[PDB]
From Swiss-Prot:
It comes from Campylobacter jejuni subsp. jejuni serotype O:2 (strain ATCC 700819 / NCTC 11168). Its EC number is 5.3.1.16. InterPro entries: Aldolase_TIM (IPR013785), His_biosynth (IPR006062), HisA_bact_arch (IPR006063), Isoase_HisA-like (IPR044524), Isoase_HisA-like_bact (IPR023016), RibuloseP-bd_barrel (IPR011060). The active site is at 8 (proton acceptor), 130 (proton donor). Keywords: Amino-acid biosynthesis, Cytoplasm, Histidine biosynthesis, Isomerase. This is 1-(5-phosphoribosyl)-5-[(5-phosphoribosylamino)methylideneamino] imidazole-4-carboxamide isomerase. CDD domains: HisA (cd04732).
Length: 229
């Protein structure tokens, strides 16, 4: 299991969207490029970037900043943000982005997702699934495990699975893992301390950590150390 430090960007600014009853925006002082180099210098080997500006309106995707980030960062950069076209994905991988996160269309259009998968390969493509517990885990009507079953048999390797109720939902991941042992799970949501990281050790291939690193709850060094085998 590896830590994956994350930054959410709006108009070149590092922010975070706190969620719950009211979506609230907190703007940080950090320069995105400087913060990412710092994470890298601390030992991060994977970085996650969410373009919230592009996620809100694809015409205003932050290509210029993403491009620059991709070519100064010497480790793997992964990018997400309402990405829903092959052109988008191809533009991003051309900037030097290692992996692109798709997912808003995982069910409204399974054929395009498959197409993206075949064209660019399973190592370059991550499927984002937001999932909730009703009587069963469903995608936010369809069963999560069945949606996973479908993509798993078509060479899907990477998923970014978020419980949108959230510490972390350890039970959710232990059992995705129990059933789909070959899927590389990235956990996200609810990471509040080192203990969340420890509880996911051996279960998830990656843990997305944003707020905790930004607010100084723990450091990249501490995260890497406690995930070390």
């Amino acid at each position: 299991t590896q830590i994956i430090p994350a930054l959410d960007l709006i108009d070149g600014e590092v922010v975070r969207l706190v969620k719950g009853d009211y979506e609230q925006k907190k703007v940080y002082k950090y320069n995105p490029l400087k913060k990412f180099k710092e994470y890298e210098k601390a030992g991060a080997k994977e970085l996650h970037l969410v373009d919230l500006t592009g996620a809100k309106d694809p015409s205003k995707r932050q290509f210029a900043l993403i491009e620059k980030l991709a070519k100064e960062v010497s480790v793997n950069l992964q990018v997400g943000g309402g990405i829903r076209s092959k052109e988008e994905v191809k533009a991003l991988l051309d900037c030097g982005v290692k992996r692109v996160v798709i997912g808003s269309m995982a069910i409204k259009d399974a054929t395009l997702c498959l197409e993206i998968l075949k064209e660019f390969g399973s190592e370059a493509i991550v499927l984002a699934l937001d999932t909730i517990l009703k009587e069963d885990y469903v995608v936010a009507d369809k069963k999560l495990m069945e949606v996973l079953d479908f993509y798993s048999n078509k060479g899907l390797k990477h998923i970014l699975c978020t419980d949108i109720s959230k510490g972390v939902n350890v039970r959710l991941y232990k059992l995705i893992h129990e059933i789909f042992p070959n899927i590389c799970i990235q956990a996200s949501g609810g990471v509040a301390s080192l203990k969340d990281l420890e509880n996911l050790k051996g279960i998830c291939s990656g843990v997305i950590v944003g707020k905790a690193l930004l607010d100084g709850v723990f450091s990249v060094e501490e995260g890497i150390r406690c995930l070390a085998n």
